[PDB]
């Protein structure tokens with residue numbers, strides 16, 4: 001229950017819990033890469049109007065099976081969505097998704113095309129995760145591709161220019177940068193009891209490899225200039 005992957009999953013849920021609670025009441029939210037809808041229950045209990053987008057139709061089909069009434073699912077990738085939509089967004093959420101379009105675009109193009117509104121971004125910084133090798137979490141660079149193994153699952157990802165992305169964000173927003181290591185809030189996830197969360201935070205405080213994993217998942221709290 002205290003594997004590196006389980007603790008990473010809980011800390012990710014902690015950040016998502018705090019970020020979604022922090023959105024201004026009644027915001028019109030764009031969630032980039034909504035996927036299978038893990039954040040559905042967090043949006044469901046808030047006064048928010050949410051549009052969840054994704055490039056993969058199969059992922060959105062799963063999200064539809066239990067989607068809240070305040071979430072609308074659109075099968076469009078970020079760049080195509082921002083062009084076509086009539087919506088005016090007042091908050092942008094992007095949890096572990098932006099590194100995909102950043103790998104195929106100039107980071108200033110992605111940043112300039114984001115709606116000019118507050119945002120929360122969680123993104124792996126591959127250069128800070130490289131070489132971490134634990135039984136349930138590993139990141140290796142194979143030629144030009146990143147192989148991120150999380151338990152018995154492997155994500156193959158392309159490189160993106162993290163350094164250019166951070167400078168692009170600073171040109172458009174007041175940026176507050178952090179990482180998952182900064183999280184203290186218990187995830188909304190009912191399966192993570194207060195006793196389990198206490199044990200996970202105690203493990204993080206005592207294990208440098210776990211700290212390195214959480215430190216490589218960068219958080220950005222953005223307010224437009």
Ligand SMILES: Nc1ncnc2c1ncn2[C@@H]1O[C@H](CSCC[C@H](N)C(=O)O)[C@@H](O)[C@H]1O
Nearest residue numbers: 033035038054055056077078095097100101
């Ligand atoms: N260009 C793009 N625009 C929108 N979504 C994209 C994208 N490239 C990849 N994605 C999607 O981004 C998702 C990342 S997985 C994370 C899903 C969800 N945000 C969560 O935190 O649980 C995947 O579903 C993937 O299909």
